[PDB]
């Protein structure tokens, strides 16, 4: 930012935003898949209880 213009720092920042936004999508997708596995384990533990 402190190195480029409002219309030139927009392309470079948009690339970084896309990259880090992809990071968040990867993170959240894996938490949902892994939470289903711990949920299946909690169901087994409740059934044995």
């Amino acid at each position: 930012l402190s190195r480029l213009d409002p219309p030139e720092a927009e392309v470079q920042i948009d690339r970084l935003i896309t990259g880090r936004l992809q990071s968040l999508q990867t993170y959240v997708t894996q938490q949902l898949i892994r939470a289903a596995e711990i949920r299946a384990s909690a169901n087994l533990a409740a059934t044995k209880m």
Binding site: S2, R3, L4
Partner: protein
């Protein structure tokens, strides 16, 4: 006397305060392309060499 193109000079610029506002009192400059930096924000950055 600028040096010819096959044997160009290379002045290393040591410690100073660098007012770039000057360099704006020489002509129309058929060109003036700043590549990594944007030229409106040169008076607020630190460079090493």
């Amino acid at each position: 006397r600028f040096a010819s193109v096959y044997a160009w000079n290379r002045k290393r610029i040591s410690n100073c305060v660098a007012d770039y506002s000057v360099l704006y009192n020489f002509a129309p400059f058929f060109a003036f392309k700043c590549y990594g930096v944007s030229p409106t924000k040169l008076n607020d950055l630190c460079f090493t060499n």
